Write a protein that binds this DNA or RNA. Structure first.
Ligand SMILES: [K+]
Ligand SMILES: [K+]
Ligand SMILES: [Mg+2]
Ligand SMILES: [Mg+2]
Ligand SMILES: [Mg+2]
Ligand SMILES: [Mg+2]
Ligand SMILES: [Mg+2]
Ligand SMILES: [Mg+2]
Ligand SMILES: [Mg+2]
Ligand SMILES: [Mg+2]
Ligand SMILES: [Mg+2]
Ligand SMILES: [Mg+2]
Ligand SMILES: [Mg+2]
Ligand SMILES: [Mg+2]
Ligand SMILES: [Mg+2]
Ligand SMILES: [Mg+2]
Ligand SMILES: [Mg+2]
Ligand SMILES: [Mg+2]
Ligand SMILES: [Mg+2]
Lengths: 51, 14, 112, 81, 109, 43, 152, 99
RNA sequence: GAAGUAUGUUAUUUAAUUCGGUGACCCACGAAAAACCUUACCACAAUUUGAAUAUUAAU
RNA sequence: AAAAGGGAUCAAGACAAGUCAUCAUGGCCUAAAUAUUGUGGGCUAUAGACGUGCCACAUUUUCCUAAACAAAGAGAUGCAAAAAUGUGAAUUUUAGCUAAUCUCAAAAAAUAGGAUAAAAAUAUACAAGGAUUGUAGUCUGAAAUUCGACUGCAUGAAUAAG
């Protein structure tokens, strides 16, 4: 069932149902940037090659 | 302020 | 302009008229009871004629943002005012594009 | 206000009756929906039509109408010249 | 997920029987039948309403003339076909207050 | 005096009464008193 | 396996029944509305946002609801020199039971005369949860102003 | 076949009992406005409020020494720098009236 | 297709009569609701780091 | 039961087809204005002309009376019964239901009777028709004048089936 709609949900009050399409965009952005986290060159003592 | 300039002061001393 | 918050508080598609319609929704929330009182005194034929006339004048002086008739739903993705569906807060088109990709739960192409 | 039981539509207007024989200026108003009340008789209004302020002098025959009913917003359509 | 529910139905469900109570039919004094709504973890404006229904003949402390007078005061709340006075209340913010109101209201009726 | 041949004053007073009729009375200051300086910018 | 009425308490239906279980759930529901309004979730971990909880607990001065003692101890460890009360004060306990359990209301009186504008407004306001206590204040403040201006 | 004046005695009893308005003359009392339930709070929540973004993602993990680029903002700045390079940037904002 | 009339458009008018579509594939089309709002147009008033982010100085 | 039916789907390519006014985007422009806020007006103008519908031009129509038969959909941004009031729009007041429960809610054509005819062209027999306008009201809403929707009374245009 999870492969038909991105949000598998049902609620009797639809106020918790109308913003999901917008949140999907915001959530996917957080996850994309979350998995791209990297140490700062100063923490690992790596010499940053500026350019 | 104004036109931003690169923050060249970034390094860690050994 | 006095009703526009100096710090943006919208996470949806921002637009010149989306900020305008968001400010009207917040202004009406703050002055709906005050407005219902005036609308009650006017329609109450048991009150003195002067009482009904005072409320009738004060209701005319309230700012336009306080009127609920000026609230018109908009698309939270595109910011249009034409073709909006209350059940989704989007235009008929953005509803179609998100419905086919599976971003609107429960919706599917109909055929019978 | 169409319905009679709700009274007429009244709007704040600087309608100060002048002294007998005093020179009073006309009242500039954009409230084109203000109902002409019996106390407007004898007053001179300058009703806004969108661009200009068309002058008006209220008479007893106008009581009950709106101020905007005496200031044309569009110009008559005339073919040719 | 099916193994998770199968694991619950084989080891956790049977424990529910240790805390179950048998059903006892209501006595002659329990004359009111209330209804309460639940949305199972959601906040819905309709979960505050409480509905009560009773039969005028259950109020044995009233006479024939008094029982009929009660049917008249109920007005549209009385169902002649079934002979039941059903009346609800959702005037207050909390479901407990809606039950108390109906309780006090039936005492006045 | 006060002749309304068209009958508009009689029609108004029959609908809304004599409260808005000039004299010398809802018109005391309700309409003028609420009229403040710079009521609406732009005349 | 582990299942007892206590492991189920917090997920039950908050109904104002004669069964004490339905009344304890309506009291738990009220404490969750005070603590933020999140659902009762005692099975997804014990972590939370310590900074946001300290702000709500100190700067905003609002209650905080914990789904388990382990969740409360984790907030102490995360923050440095941060204390939290054991439970709500006596007054807060009474207010929760006063309305959500005992169901004490303000009976809307019957107004006979139609000229009793103030009394009649309070009647309708009392018989509808749409008018919060603050909404009725804004309505009454403006109403009293209008009734006063239309008098000699 | 029952006097109207006699029925009102029953209609008035219900009002006193259920605490409703007794208005046998159908006078306009404006009570329809009192029964109408407000709709302000339902309309105010239409547009979602501003919520977590990349800046709050960077400030959250910045304490641990982690970084992440803002591809949207970093691209916006890259575009502006390109305009100023070929003399296409924005003019200097004017703070006074034209005179 | 002739009558009356709801409606879209041309042309013309207008301070503005917002814009686009405009052979088949425009013309009850975008518009699944123009008195305010909508609204993008005009007249008269009002505002100038503005509603966003960043940086540098003060509290 | 069966000789079933409908819906969705329907490629590549071309039309430099439509959309830079949903969104998104390169280049080029505006940056005290080509940006932003309110009041009023306009988008509703009207010589001629072109497209969509609605309805009418009576005899298989329309009008009057009566005790038949549907489906589907809607009501937490609300559907509103019964009663009472008004010629009417509608008002007063809320019972119930947030729903296979309660409410909108009543199907209409039909079927069966009944009334009207020189049913418009012979002016002492001017049919059907409901545009136009006057006037008195109702509802929504600060607000119904430009410019809203219905109701009562009066007014009674063209219209011979093109
Ligand atoms: K209340
Ligand atoms: K007809
Ligand atoms: Mg330049
Ligand atoms: Mg025709
Ligand atoms: Mg055009
Ligand atoms: Mg063009
Ligand atoms: Mg193709
Ligand atoms: Mg082309
Ligand atoms: Mg073409
Ligand atoms: Mg083109
Ligand atoms: Mg663009
Ligand atoms: Mg405007
Ligand atoms: Mg148009
Ligand atoms: Mg009825
Ligand atoms: Mg219907
Ligand atoms: Mg004939
Ligand atoms: Mg005739
Ligand atoms: Mg009109
Ligand atoms: Mg034909």
């Amino acid at each position: 069932i999870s492969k038909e709609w991105k949000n598998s949900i049902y609620v009797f009050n639809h106020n918790n149902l109308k913003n999901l399409p917008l949140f999907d965009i915001n959530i996917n952005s957080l996850i994309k940037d979350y998995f791209n986290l990297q140490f700062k060159d100063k923490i690992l003592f790596k010499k940053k090659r500026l350019s | 302020e104004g036109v931003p300039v690169p923050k060249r002061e970034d390094d860690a001393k050994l | 302009s006095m009703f526009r918050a100096k710090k943006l508080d919208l996470g949806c598609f921002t637009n010149v008229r989306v900020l305008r319609d968001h400010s009207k929704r917040k202004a009406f929330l703050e002055a709906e009871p005050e407005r219902q009182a005036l609308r009650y005194v006017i329609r109450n034929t048991t009150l003195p004629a002067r009482t009904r006339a005072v409320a009738q004048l004060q209701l005319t002086q309230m700012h336009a943002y306080t009127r609920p008739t000026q609230i018109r739903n908009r698309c939270i993705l595109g910011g249009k005012s034409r073709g909006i569906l209350r059940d989704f807060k989007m235009t008929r088109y953005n509803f179609r594009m998100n419905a086919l990709m599976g971003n609107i739960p429960g919706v599917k192409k109909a055929s019978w | 206000k169409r319905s009679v039981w709700k009274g007429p539509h009244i709007v704040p207007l600087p309608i100060q009756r002048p002294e007998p024989g005093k020179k009073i200026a006309p009242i500039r108003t954009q409230a084109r929906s203000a109902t002409i009340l019996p106390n407007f008789v004898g007053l001179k209004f300058q009703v806004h039509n969108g661009k200009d302020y068309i002058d008006l002098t209220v008479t007893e025959e106008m009581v009950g109408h709106k101020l905007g009913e005496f200031s044309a917003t569009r110009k008559p359509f005339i073919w040719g010249k | 997920e099916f193994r998770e529910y199968a694991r619950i139905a084989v080891w956790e469900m049977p424990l529910l029987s240790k805390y179950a109570k048998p059903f006892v039919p209501p006595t002659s004094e329990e004359v009111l039948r209330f209804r309460y709504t639940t949305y199972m973890g959601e906040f819905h404006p309709a979960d505050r309403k409480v509905v009560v229904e009773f039969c005028p003949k259950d109020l044995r402390d009233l006479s024939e003339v008094q029982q009929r007078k009660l049917m008249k005061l109920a007005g549209p709340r009385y169902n002649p076909e079934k002979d039941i006075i059903k009346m609800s209340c959702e005037k207050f913010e909390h479901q407990a207050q809606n039950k108390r109101y109906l309780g006090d209201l039936i005492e006045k009726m | 005096v006060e002749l309304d041949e068209a009958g508009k004053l009689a029609a108004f007073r029959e609908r809304y009464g004599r409260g808005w009729d000039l004299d010398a009375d809802s018109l005391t200051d309700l309409i003028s008193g609420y009229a403040t300086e710079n009521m609406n910018p732009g005349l | 396996p582990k299942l007892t009425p206590d492991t189920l308490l917090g997920y039950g239906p908050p109904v104002a029944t004669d069964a004490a279980l339905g009344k304890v759930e309506s009291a738990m529901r009220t404490m969750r509305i005070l603590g933020g309004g999140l659902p009762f979730n005692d099975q997804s971990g014990v972590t939370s946002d310590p900074t946001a909880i300290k702000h709500r607990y100190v700067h905003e001065k609002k209650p905080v609801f914990f789904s388990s003692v382990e969740e409360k101890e984790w907030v102490r460890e995360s923050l440095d020199k941060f204390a939290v009360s054991e439970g709500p004060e006596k007054k807060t306990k009474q207010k929760i039971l006063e309305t959500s359990v005992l169901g004490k209301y303000e009976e809307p009186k019957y107004v006979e005369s139609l000229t009793e504008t103030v009394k009649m407004v309070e009647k309708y306001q009392g018989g509808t949860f749409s008018y919060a206590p603050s909404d009725a204040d804004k309505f009454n403040k403006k109403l009293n102003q209008l009734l006063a201006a239309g008098l000699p | 076949s029952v006097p109207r004046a006699r029925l009102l005695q029953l209609v008035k009893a219900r009002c006193e009992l259920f605490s409703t308005t007794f208005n046998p003359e159908g006078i306009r009392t404006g009570n329809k406005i009192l029964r109408q339930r407000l709709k302000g709070p339902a309309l105010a929540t239409y547009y979602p409020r501003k919520n977590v973004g990349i800046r709050e993602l960077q400030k959250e993990f910045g304490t641990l020494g982690l970084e992440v680029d803002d591809e949207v903002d970093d691209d916006r700045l890259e575009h502006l720098a390109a305009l100023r390079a070929r003399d296409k940037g924005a003019p200097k904002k004017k703070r006074t009236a034209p005179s």
